[PDB]
Amino acid sequence: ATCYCRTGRCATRESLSGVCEISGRLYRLCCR
Amino acid sequence: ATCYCRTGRCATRESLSGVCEISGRLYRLCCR
């Protein structure tokens, strides 16, 4: 499992596996 | 995929697939 915290989109787009709003910014999780 | 940003550990432990330190917290990603 390799996932990472993105502040918006990541190179794959359709793979939003989680979200965390931290420091007023939305951190999406996209994982492979 | 269901992932979540945890500051320490999660119920699965070593499923840490990514990290992001934000606001002094280490956001470890573990996913299912």
Curated annotation (Swiss-Prot), chains A, B:
Superkingdom per UniProt: Eukaryota
Effect of R13K: Does not impair antimicrobial activity against E.coli, E.aerogenes, S.aureus and B.cereus. Reduced induction of IL-8 secretion
Impact reported for C5S: Prohibits tetramer formation
Effect of L29A: Reduced interaction with B.antracis lef/lethal factor and decreased bactericidal activity against E.coli and S.aureus. Reduced enhancement of S.flexneri infection
Bridged cysteine pairs (disulfide): C3-C31, C5-C20, C10-C30
Annotated consequence of substituting G24R: Enhanced antibacterial activity against both E.coli and S.aureus
Impact upon substituting Y27A: Disrupts homodimer-formation. Reduced interaction with B.antracis lef/lethal factor and reduced killing of S.aureus. Reduced enhancement of S.flexneri infection
Known outcome of mutating R32A: Impairs antimicrobial activity against E.coli, E.aerogenes, S.aureus and B.cereus. Reduced induction of IL-8 secretion
Record protein name field: HD5(63-94)
Taxonomic source organism: Homo sapiens (Human)
Lineage, opening ranks: Eukaryota, Metazoa, Chordata, Craniata, Vertebrata
Underlying gene: DEFA5
